[PDB]
Every structure is written in C-alpha cells, then in structure tokens.
Coordinates of N, CA and C and ligand atoms in Angstrom, one line a residue:
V1 N 270.4 172.4 -152.9 CA 271.1 173.6 -152.5 C 270.5 175.1 -153.1
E2 N 270.8 176.1 -152.3 CA 270.2 177.4 -152.6 C 268.7 177.6 -152.2
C3 N 268.3 178.4 -151.2 CA 267.0 178.6 -150.9 C 266.4 179.7 -152.0
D4 N 265.1 179.4 -152.3 CA 264.5 180.2 -153.3 C 263.6 181.3 -152.9
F5 N 263.9 182.6 -152.7 CA 263.0 183.5 -152.2 C 262.4 184.3 -153.5
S6 N 262.3 183.7 -154.6 CA 261.8 184.2 -155.8 C 260.5 184.5 -155.9
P7 N 259.5 183.4 -155.5 CA 258.1 183.8 -155.2 C 257.6 184.8 -154.8
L8 N 258.4 185.4 -153.8 CA 258.1 186.4 -153.0 C 258.3 187.9 -154.0
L9 N 259.1 187.7 -154.9 CA 259.3 188.9 -155.7 C 258.4 188.8 -157.1
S10 N 257.6 187.9 -157.3 CA 256.8 187.9 -158.4 C 255.3 188.2 -158.1
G11 N 254.6 189.3 -158.5 CA 253.5 189.4 -158.5 C 252.8 190.4 -157.4
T12 N 251.5 190.1 -157.0 CA 250.8 190.8 -155.9 C 251.1 190.1 -154.7
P13 N 251.5 190.7 -153.6 CA 251.5 190.2 -152.3 C 250.2 190.2 -151.7
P14 N 249.6 189.0 -150.9 CA 248.3 188.9 -150.4 C 248.4 189.7 -149.3
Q15 N 247.1 190.0 -148.7 CA 246.8 190.7 -147.6 C 247.0 189.8 -146.4
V16 N 247.4 190.6 -145.2 CA 247.8 189.9 -144.0 C 247.2 188.6 -143.6
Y17 N 245.8 188.6 -143.7 CA 245.2 187.4 -143.3 C 245.1 186.2 -144.3
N18 N 245.7 186.6 -145.5 CA 246.2 185.5 -146.4 C 247.4 185.3 -146.8
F19 N 248.3 185.5 -145.7 CA 249.7 185.6 -145.9 C 250.3 184.3 -146.5
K20 N 251.2 184.5 -147.6 CA 251.8 183.2 -148.1 C 253.0 183.0 -147.3
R21 N 253.1 181.6 -147.2 CA 254.3 180.9 -146.5 C 255.2 180.1 -147.3
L22 N 256.4 180.5 -147.3 CA 257.6 179.7 -148.0 C 258.4 178.9 -147.0
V23 N 258.4 177.6 -147.2 CA 259.1 176.7 -146.2 C 260.3 176.2 -146.8
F24 N 261.4 176.2 -146.1 CA 262.8 175.9 -146.5 C 263.5 174.9 -145.5
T25 N 263.8 173.8 -146.1 CA 264.6 172.5 -145.5 C 265.8 172.2 -146.5
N26 N 266.8 172.0 -146.2 CA 268.1 171.3 -147.0 C 268.4 172.4 -148.0
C27 N 268.9 173.5 -147.7 CA 269.4 174.6 -148.7 C 270.2 175.5 -148.0
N28 N 270.6 176.5 -148.7 CA 271.5 177.7 -148.3 C 271.1 179.0 -148.7
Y29 N 271.0 179.8 -147.6 CA 270.3 181.1 -147.8 C 271.3 182.3 -147.7
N30 N 270.9 183.5 -148.4 CA 271.6 184.7 -148.2 C 270.5 185.6 -147.8
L31 N 270.1 185.9 -146.5 CA 269.0 186.7 -146.1 C 269.4 188.2 -146.3
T32 N 270.5 188.7 -146.2 CA 270.8 190.2 -146.4 C 271.0 190.3 -148.0
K33 N 271.0 189.4 -148.8 CA 270.8 189.5 -150.1 C 269.3 189.8 -150.6
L34 N 268.5 189.2 -149.9 CA 267.2 189.5 -150.0 C 266.7 190.8 -149.6
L35 N 267.2 191.2 -148.5 CA 266.8 192.5 -147.8 C 267.4 193.7 -148.5
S36 N 268.4 193.3 -149.4 CA 269.1 194.5 -150.0 C 268.2 195.1 -151.1
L37 N 267.2 194.3 -151.5 CA 266.2 194.8 -152.5 C 265.3 195.8 -151.9
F38 N 265.1 195.7 -150.6 CA 264.0 196.5 -150.0 C 264.5 197.6 -149.2
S39 N 263.8 198.7 -149.1 CA 264.1 199.8 -147.8 C 263.6 199.2 -146.7
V40 N 264.5 198.6 -145.8 CA 264.0 198.0 -144.5 C 263.7 199.1 -143.4
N41 N 262.5 199.2 -142.9 CA 262.1 200.2 -142.0 C 262.2 199.7 -140.6
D42 N 261.8 198.5 -140.4 CA 261.6 197.8 -139.1 C 262.1 196.2 -139.2
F43 N 262.8 196.0 -138.1 CA 263.4 194.6 -138.1 C 263.6 194.2 -136.7
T44 N 262.6 193.5 -136.0 CA 262.8 193.0 -134.7 C 262.6 191.4 -134.6
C45 N 263.3 190.9 -133.6 CA 263.4 189.5 -133.4 C 262.7 189.0 -131.9
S46 N 262.5 187.8 -131.9 CA 262.2 187.3 -130.5 C 263.0 185.9 -130.2
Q47 N 263.7 185.9 -129.2 CA 264.5 184.7 -128.8 C 265.8 184.6 -130.0
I48 N 266.2 185.6 -130.6 CA 267.1 185.7 -131.5 C 267.5 187.1 -131.9
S49 N 268.5 187.3 -132.9 CA 268.7 188.8 -133.1 C 268.7 188.9 -134.7
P50 N 268.5 190.0 -135.3 CA 268.9 190.3 -136.9 C 270.1 189.8 -137.4
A51 N 271.2 189.9 -136.4 CA 272.4 189.1 -136.9 C 272.6 187.8 -136.9
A52 N 272.1 187.2 -135.8 CA 272.0 185.9 -135.6 C 271.1 185.0 -136.7
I53 N 270.1 185.5 -136.9 CA 269.2 185.0 -137.8 C 269.6 185.0 -139.4
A54 N 270.5 186.0 -139.7 CA 271.1 186.0 -141.0 C 272.3 185.1 -141.1
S55 N 272.7 184.3 -140.1 CA 273.9 183.6 -140.1 C 273.9 182.3 -139.2
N56 N 272.7 181.8 -139.1 CA 272.7 180.5 -138.2 C 272.0 179.2 -139.1
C57 N 272.5 178.0 -138.6 CA 271.9 176.8 -139.3 C 270.8 176.3 -138.5
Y58 N 269.8 176.1 -139.4 CA 268.3 175.6 -138.8 C 267.9 174.3 -139.4
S59 N 266.9 173.7 -138.8 CA 266.4 172.4 -139.3 C 265.2 172.8 -140.2
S60 N 265.0 174.1 -140.0 CA 263.6 174.7 -140.8 C 263.6 176.1 -140.7
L61 N 263.4 176.8 -142.0 CA 263.1 178.3 -142.1 C 261.8 178.4 -142.6
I62 N 260.9 179.1 -142.0 CA 259.6 179.6 -142.7 C 259.5 181.1 -142.7
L63 N 259.1 181.4 -144.0 CA 259.0 183.0 -144.4 C 257.6 183.3 -144.8
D64 N 256.8 184.1 -144.0 CA 255.6 184.6 -144.3 C 255.8 185.9 -145.0
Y65 N 255.1 186.3 -145.9 CA 255.0 187.5 -146.6 C 253.6 188.0 -147.1
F66 N 253.4 189.3 -146.8 CA 252.0 190.0 -147.3 C 252.2 191.5 -147.2
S67 N 251.3 192.2 -148.0 CA 251.3 193.6 -147.9 C 250.9 194.0 -146.7
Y68 N 251.6 195.0 -146.1 CA 251.3 195.7 -144.8 C 251.6 197.1 -144.7
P69 N 250.7 198.0 -144.2 CA 251.1 199.4 -144.2 C 251.9 199.7 -143.0
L70 N 253.0 200.3 -143.1 CA 253.8 200.7 -142.1 C 252.9 201.5 -140.9
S71 N 251.8 202.2 -141.2 CA 251.1 202.8 -140.3 C 250.5 201.8 -139.3
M72 N 250.5 200.4 -139.4 CA 249.9 199.7 -138.5 C 250.9 198.7 -137.8
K73 N 252.2 199.4 -137.7 CA 253.3 198.6 -137.0 C 253.1 198.2 -135.6
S74 N 252.3 199.0 -134.8 CA 252.0 198.8 -133.4 C 251.1 197.4 -133.1
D75 N 250.3 197.3 -134.3 CA 249.2 196.3 -134.2 C 249.8 194.8 -134.4
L76 N 251.0 194.5 -134.9 CA 251.6 193.5 -134.9 C 252.0 192.8 -133.4
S77 N 252.3 193.7 -132.6 CA 252.5 193.1 -131.2 C 251.3 192.4 -130.5
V78 N 251.5 191.1 -129.9 CA 250.4 190.6 -129.4 C 250.0 191.3 -127.9
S79 N 250.8 192.0 -127.5 CA 250.6 193.2 -126.4 C 249.4 194.0 -127.1
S80 N 248.7 194.6 -126.5 CA 247.4 195.5 -127.0 C 246.5 194.2 -127.2
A81 N 245.2 194.6 -127.7 CA 244.4 194.0 -128.5 C 244.8 193.7 -129.9
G82 N 244.4 194.7 -130.7 CA 244.9 194.9 -132.1 C 244.2 193.8 -133.0
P83 N 243.5 194.1 -134.0 CA 242.8 193.2 -134.8 C 243.8 192.2 -135.5
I84 N 245.0 192.8 -136.0 CA 246.0 192.0 -136.6 C 246.4 190.8 -135.9
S85 N 246.9 190.9 -134.7 CA 247.4 189.8 -133.9 C 246.3 188.9 -133.4
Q86 N 245.0 189.4 -133.2 CA 244.0 188.6 -132.8 C 243.3 187.8 -133.8
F87 N 243.1 188.3 -135.0 CA 242.3 187.7 -136.1 C 243.0 187.5 -137.4
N88 N 244.2 188.0 -137.6 CA 244.9 188.0 -139.0 C 246.3 187.3 -139.0
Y89 N 247.3 187.5 -138.2 CA 248.4 187.0 -138.1 C 249.0 187.0 -136.9
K90 N 249.6 185.7 -136.5 CA 250.2 185.5 -135.3 C 251.4 184.6 -135.2
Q91 N 252.6 185.1 -135.0 CA 253.9 184.2 -135.1 C 254.0 183.3 -133.8
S92 N 254.6 182.1 -133.9 CA 255.0 181.2 -132.9 C 255.7 182.2 -131.6
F93 N 255.3 181.7 -130.4 CA 255.9 182.3 -129.0 C 256.9 181.4 -128.6
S94 N 257.0 180.3 -129.1 CA 257.9 179.0 -128.9 C 259.2 179.2 -129.6
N95 N 259.2 179.1 -130.9 CA 260.2 179.1 -131.7 C 260.8 180.6 -131.9
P96 N 262.0 180.8 -132.2 CA 262.5 182.1 -132.5 C 262.1 182.8 -133.8
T97 N 261.4 183.9 -133.7 CA 260.8 184.8 -134.7 C 261.5 185.9 -135.0
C98 N 261.4 186.4 -136.3 CA 261.7 187.7 -136.6 C 260.6 188.3 -137.5
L99 N 260.4 189.6 -137.5 CA 259.3 190.3 -138.3 C 260.0 191.6 -138.8
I100 N 259.7 191.8 -140.2 CA 260.4 192.6 -140.9 C 259.4 193.6 -141.6
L101 N 259.6 194.9 -141.4 CA 258.5 195.9 -142.3 C 259.5 196.5 -143.3
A102 N 259.1 196.3 -144.5 CA 260.0 197.0 -145.6 C 259.1 197.7 -146.6
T103 N 259.6 198.7 -147.4 CA 259.1 199.3 -148.4 C 259.8 198.7 -149.6
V104 N 259.0 198.6 -150.8 CA 259.5 198.3 -152.0 C 259.8 199.5 -152.9
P105 N 261.1 199.6 -153.4 CA 261.6 200.8 -154.0 C 260.9 200.9 -155.5
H106 N 261.0 202.0 -156.1 CA 260.5 202.2 -157.4 C 261.1 201.3 -158.3
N107 N 262.4 201.1 -158.3 CA 263.4 200.3 -159.1 C 263.1 198.8 -158.9
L108 N 262.2 198.5 -158.1 CA 261.8 197.0 -157.9 C 260.4 196.8 -158.6
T109 N 260.2 196.2 -159.7 CA 259.1 196.4 -160.6 C 258.1 195.2 -160.8
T110 N 258.8 194.1 -160.5 CA 258.1 192.7 -160.7 C 257.0 192.5 -159.4
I111 N 257.1 193.5 -158.6 CA 256.2 193.4 -157.5 C 255.1 194.4 -157.6
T112 N 253.8 193.9 -157.9 CA 252.7 194.8 -158.3 C 251.9 195.2 -157.0
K113 N 251.2 196.2 -157.1 CA 250.5 196.7 -155.9 C 248.8 196.4 -156.2
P114 N 248.3 196.0 -155.1 CA 247.0 195.9 -154.8 C 246.1 197.2 -154.8
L115 N 244.8 197.2 -154.9 CA 244.0 198.5 -154.7 C 244.2 199.3 -153.4
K116 N 244.4 198.4 -152.3 CA 244.5 199.0 -151.0 C 245.1 197.8 -150.0
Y117 N 245.2 198.3 -148.9 CA 245.5 197.3 -147.9 C 244.1 196.8 -147.1
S118 N 243.9 195.3 -147.1 CA 242.8 195.0 -146.3 C 243.2 194.3 -145.1
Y119 N 242.3 194.2 -144.0 CA 242.6 193.5 -142.9 C 241.3 193.1 -142.2
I120 N 241.2 192.1 -141.3 CA 240.2 191.6 -140.5 C 239.9 192.4 -139.3
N121 N 238.9 193.0 -138.8 CA 238.9 194.0 -137.7 C 238.2 193.2 -136.6
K122 N 237.4 192.1 -137.0 CA 236.5 191.4 -136.2 C 236.3 189.9 -136.7
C123 N 236.5 189.0 -135.8 CA 236.2 187.5 -136.0 C 235.6 186.9 -134.8
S124 N 234.2 186.8 -134.7 CA 233.7 186.3 -133.7 C 232.5 185.3 -133.8
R125 N 232.1 184.6 -132.8 CA 231.2 183.4 -133.0 C 229.9 183.7 -132.0
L126 N 228.8 183.7 -132.5 CA 227.5 183.9 -131.7 C 227.1 182.5 -131.3
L127 N 226.8 182.5 -129.9 CA 226.3 181.2 -129.3 C 224.9 180.9 -129.4
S128 N 224.5 179.8 -128.9 CA 223.0 179.4 -129.2 C 221.9 180.4 -128.5
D129 N 222.2 181.1 -127.4 CA 221.5 182.0 -126.7 C 221.1 183.3 -127.6
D130 N 222.0 183.2 -128.8 CA 221.9 184.5 -129.8 C 222.2 185.8 -129.0
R131 N 222.9 185.8 -127.9 CA 223.4 187.0 -127.3 C 224.8 186.9 -127.1
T132 N 225.4 185.9 -126.7 CA 226.8 186.0 -126.4 C 227.8 185.9 -127.6
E133 N 228.9 186.7 -127.7 CA 229.7 186.6 -128.7 C 231.2 186.2 -128.2
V134 N 231.7 185.2 -128.8 CA 233.1 184.7 -128.4 C 234.0 184.8 -129.6
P135 N 235.0 185.8 -129.3 CA 236.1 186.0 -130.3 C 236.7 184.8 -130.8
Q136 N 237.1 184.7 -132.2 CA 237.8 183.6 -132.7 C 239.1 184.1 -133.2
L137 N 240.1 183.7 -132.2 CA 241.3 184.3 -132.4 C 242.3 183.2 -133.2
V138 N 243.1 183.9 -134.0 CA 244.2 183.2 -134.9 C 245.2 182.5 -134.0
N139 N 245.5 181.2 -134.3 CA 246.4 180.6 -133.7 C 247.8 180.8 -134.4
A140 N 249.2 180.6 -133.7 CA 250.2 180.7 -134.3 C 250.3 179.8 -135.7
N141 N 250.9 180.2 -136.7 CA 251.1 179.4 -138.2 C 249.9 179.1 -138.7
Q142 N 248.8 179.5 -138.1 CA 247.4 179.2 -138.7 C 246.7 180.3 -139.5
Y143 N 245.7 180.1 -140.2 CA 244.8 181.3 -140.8 C 243.8 181.4 -139.9
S144 N 243.0 182.5 -140.1 CA 241.9 183.1 -139.3 C 240.7 182.0 -139.7
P145 N 239.9 181.6 -138.5 CA 238.6 180.8 -138.7 C 237.8 181.7 -139.8
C146 N 237.8 182.8 -140.1 CA 237.2 183.6 -141.0 C 237.6 183.6 -142.2
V147 N 238.7 183.2 -142.7 CA 239.3 183.3 -144.0 C 238.5 182.8 -145.0
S148 N 237.5 181.9 -144.7 CA 236.6 181.1 -145.7 C 235.4 182.0 -146.1
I149 N 235.3 183.1 -145.2 CA 234.0 184.0 -145.5 C 234.5 185.5 -145.7
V150 N 235.8 185.7 -145.6 CA 236.3 187.0 -145.9 C 237.2 187.1 -147.3
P151 N 236.7 187.9 -148.2 CA 237.4 187.7 -149.5 C 238.9 188.3 -149.5
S152 N 239.6 187.9 -150.5 CA 241.1 188.2 -150.6 C 241.3 189.8 -150.5
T153 N 240.1 190.6 -150.8 CA 240.3 191.8 -150.8 C 239.0 192.4 -150.2
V154 N 239.0 193.4 -149.1 CA 237.9 193.9 -148.5 C 237.4 194.9 -149.6
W155 N 236.1 194.8 -150.1 CA 235.5 195.7 -151.0 C 235.3 197.1 -150.6
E156 N 234.8 197.2 -149.4 CA 234.3 198.5 -148.7 C 234.5 198.5 -147.3
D157 N 235.3 199.4 -146.8 CA 235.5 199.5 -145.4 C 234.2 199.4 -144.5
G158 N 234.1 198.3 -143.6 CA 233.0 198.1 -142.8 C 232.2 196.9 -143.2
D159 N 232.6 196.4 -144.5 CA 231.8 195.3 -144.8 C 231.8 194.0 -143.7
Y160 N 230.6 193.3 -143.7 CA 230.3 192.3 -142.7 C 230.1 191.1 -143.5
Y161 N 230.6 189.9 -142.9 CA 230.3 188.6 -143.4 C 229.9 187.7 -142.4
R162 N 228.8 186.9 -142.8 CA 228.3 185.8 -141.8 C 228.3 184.5 -142.4
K163 N 228.3 183.5 -141.6 CA 228.1 182.1 -142.1 C 227.4 181.4 -141.0
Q164 N 226.4 180.6 -141.5 CA 225.6 179.7 -140.6 C 226.3 178.6 -140.4
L165 N 226.6 178.1 -139.0 CA 227.4 176.8 -138.8 C 226.6 175.8 -138.7
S166 N 226.9 174.6 -139.4 CA 226.4 173.5 -139.1 C 226.6 172.8 -137.8
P167 N 225.8 171.8 -137.2 CA 226.1 171.2 -135.9 C 227.4 170.6 -135.6
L168 N 228.0 169.9 -136.9 CA 229.3 169.6 -136.9 C 230.4 170.7 -136.5
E169 N 230.0 171.7 -137.0 CA 230.9 172.9 -136.6 C 230.4 173.5 -135.3
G170 N 229.5 172.9 -134.6 CA 229.1 173.4 -133.2 C 227.7 174.3 -133.3
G171 N 227.3 174.6 -134.4 CA 226.1 175.4 -134.6 C 226.6 177.1 -134.5
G172 N 225.3 177.8 -134.5 CA 225.5 179.3 -134.3 C 226.0 180.0 -135.5
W173 N 226.6 181.1 -135.4 CA 227.1 181.9 -136.6 C 228.5 182.4 -136.4
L174 N 229.1 182.4 -137.6 CA 230.5 183.0 -137.6 C 230.3 184.4 -138.0
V175 N 231.0 185.4 -137.6 CA 230.7 186.7 -137.8 C 232.0 187.5 -138.0
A176 N 232.4 188.0 -139.2 CA 233.5 188.9 -139.4 C 233.2 190.2 -140.2
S177 N 234.2 191.1 -139.8 CA 234.1 192.5 -140.5 C 235.4 192.8 -141.1
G178 N 235.4 193.4 -142.2 CA 236.6 193.9 -142.7 C 237.0 195.4 -142.8
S179 N 238.2 195.8 -142.7 CA 238.5 197.2 -142.9 C 239.7 197.4 -144.0
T180 N 239.7 198.6 -144.3 CA 240.7 198.9 -145.4 C 241.6 200.1 -145.1
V181 N 242.8 200.1 -145.6 CA 243.7 201.3 -145.5 C 244.1 201.6 -146.9
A182 N 244.2 202.9 -147.3 CA 244.4 203.3 -148.6 C 245.9 203.0 -149.0
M183 N 246.1 202.7 -150.2 CA 247.5 202.2 -150.9 C 248.4 203.4 -150.8
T184 N 249.7 202.9 -150.5 CA 250.8 204.0 -150.3 C 251.6 204.2 -151.6
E185 N 252.3 205.2 -151.8 CA 253.1 205.6 -152.9 C 253.8 204.5 -153.4
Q186 N 254.7 204.0 -152.6 CA 255.4 202.6 -152.8 C 254.7 201.6 -151.8
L187 N 254.6 200.5 -152.2 CA 254.0 199.4 -151.4 C 254.8 199.0 -150.2
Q188 N 254.1 198.7 -149.2 CA 254.8 198.4 -147.9 C 254.3 197.0 -147.4
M189 N 255.4 196.1 -146.9 CA 255.2 194.7 -146.8 C 255.8 194.4 -145.5
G190 N 255.2 193.2 -145.1 CA 255.6 192.6 -143.9 C 256.4 191.2 -144.2
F191 N 257.4 190.8 -143.4 CA 257.8 189.5 -143.4 C 258.0 188.9 -142.2
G192 N 257.2 187.6 -142.1 CA 257.7 186.8 -140.7 C 258.5 185.8 -141.0
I193 N 259.6 185.7 -140.1 CA 260.5 184.5 -140.3 C 260.4 183.7 -139.0
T194 N 260.3 182.4 -139.1 CA 260.3 181.5 -138.0 C 261.3 180.5 -138.2
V195 N 262.2 180.2 -137.3 CA 263.3 179.2 -137.5 C 263.1 178.1 -136.5
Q196 N 263.6 176.9 -136.8 CA 263.6 175.8 -135.7 C 265.0 175.3 -135.7
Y197 N 265.5 174.8 -134.5 CA 266.7 173.9 -134.4 C 266.6 172.5 -134.2
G198 N 267.3 171.7 -134.8 CA 267.1 170.2 -134.5 C 268.5 169.6 -133.8
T199 N 268.6 168.5 -133.8 CA 269.8 167.8 -133.4 C 270.9 167.6 -134.4
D200 N 270.4 167.0 -135.5 CA 271.3 166.8 -136.7 C 270.7 167.4 -137.9
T201 N 269.4 167.8 -137.6 CA 268.5 168.3 -138.9 C 268.9 169.7 -139.4
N202 N 269.8 170.4 -139.0 CA 270.2 171.7 -139.0 C 271.0 171.9 -140.5
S203 N 270.2 171.7 -141.6 CA 270.5 171.5 -142.9 C 270.4 173.1 -143.7
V204 N 269.5 173.9 -143.1 CA 269.4 175.3 -143.6 C 270.4 176.1 -143.2
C205 N 271.5 176.2 -144.0 CA 272.6 177.0 -143.5 C 272.9 178.2 -144.4
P206 N 273.6 179.3 -143.8 CA 273.8 180.4 -144.6 C 274.8 180.1 -145.6
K207 N 274.9 180.6 -146.9 CA 276.0 180.4 -147.7 C 277.2 180.9 -147.4
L208 N 278.4 180.2 -147.7 CA 279.7 180.9 -147.3 C 280.4 181.3 -148.5
Ligands
NAG301 C1 275.0 187.6 -149.6 O1 274.4 188.7 -150.2 C2 274.8 190.0 -149.9 C3 274.0 191.0 -150.5 O2 274.4 192.3 -150.1 C4 276.4 190.2 -150.3 O3 276.8 191.3 -149.7 C5 277.2 189.1 -149.6 O4 278.5 189.0 -150.2 C6 276.6 187.6 -149.9 N1 277.2 186.7 -149.4 C7 277.6 185.5 -149.7 C8 278.5 184.4 -149.0 O5 277.2 185.3 -151.0

C-alpha cells in the first residue's frame, strides 16, 4: 500500500539522457499530492487527460524524472527533429503517457541543483566506408545508445565523444556530442508518466 514518490524529492535530478525511472505496481497513489509541491508550468497527456491520470486504476505506473529547462519545451515533441526526442528521451506512443514541466519552489530544499542542464545534441554511427553517418535514435522506455560514452554532466558545450566499435557491435565508430544550458534561478524539471491497463492486474489505484 502507498506509492512512494520520495526518491524524486531527495538529491540532484539527473540530466534528461540519464532519466531516473520509478516503477509502481500494487499500491495507492495521490498524484495531485506530489504536484502540490511544485509550480506546474506544463502538463500534457496522450491517450489520457490530466484529470483521468490522477484518478484511474492501472496495472502499472512508470514515472521518469530529470532536470529540464522550461526553455526547451518544444523539443520534447517527437514532431520536429529535436535532439531531445531523437537522442535523449522518448515516451511510448502505444501506452497512455503524460509529460509534466515543473519548477521547484524556494521552499522545497531537499532537491539540489546541478551546475547546468546537459543534453545530447547528436548521436550517430559512422559506417565502414568512413563517409556515411547513421543517426542512433533513442527508443521508447530506453536510454540512448550513447549514454555509455556521454558523462552524467557535459563539461563544456560542444564536447565530442567517440567509441570504436568491436565486430560484435557491428564495427565502425559511435559518435556523440553534448550541449549545455545555463542553470536557472529555481531548478526546472520534467516528469514522464506512462500507465498500463490490464484485465485484473489494475492494482495501482488512487487513494480514497
Ligand atoms: C491527495 O492529496 C491532495 C493534495 O492537495 C489533497 O488535496 C487530497 O485531499 C488528497 N486525497 C486523498 C484521498 O488523500
């Protein structure tokens, strides 16, 4: 009983390409309890609504969280190119999702700020001909192929990262570049919620 959103409130939220995932089964949630702590700037859903998501019974609820600057709001949509959706973070297009952009108030103190926001501006793979570059896109619910070579913080805007690939990996080179955005007065964050419905497995219910 009782879903635990605590880990979200303790410490420094990772950068978008290192999003932390909290998984819930068999428990009871109060979503509007959690959002009461933040100033909520944006809240959009897919195949569900902000009202419905705060009040439905699911077989599973997944909550991704990460530091994210409000200024890159538009880059979250799969429409566009956008480094974010292509190389950093992508929600399921099959299951009902929600995305929330929130600022953390001064009076919320247990959440510490990083030096800046970092993201991956490019993730690509150079073929054997040493000419052709093939983008390495992030899949839903997965991390970037490049998370192994990109550090948790981008040191300097424009930094490049390369890895030589073994023949088991198909050969060639993995190439990534990182970008930075300056930290804001109050930290800004993103929350990705994904829900699933079952037949009898709908044990994630709002508390009454
Ligand atoms: C859930 O939390 C919100 C926080 O604003 C509160 O208003 C509401 O009464 C709570 N609901 C239940 C059933 O605890």
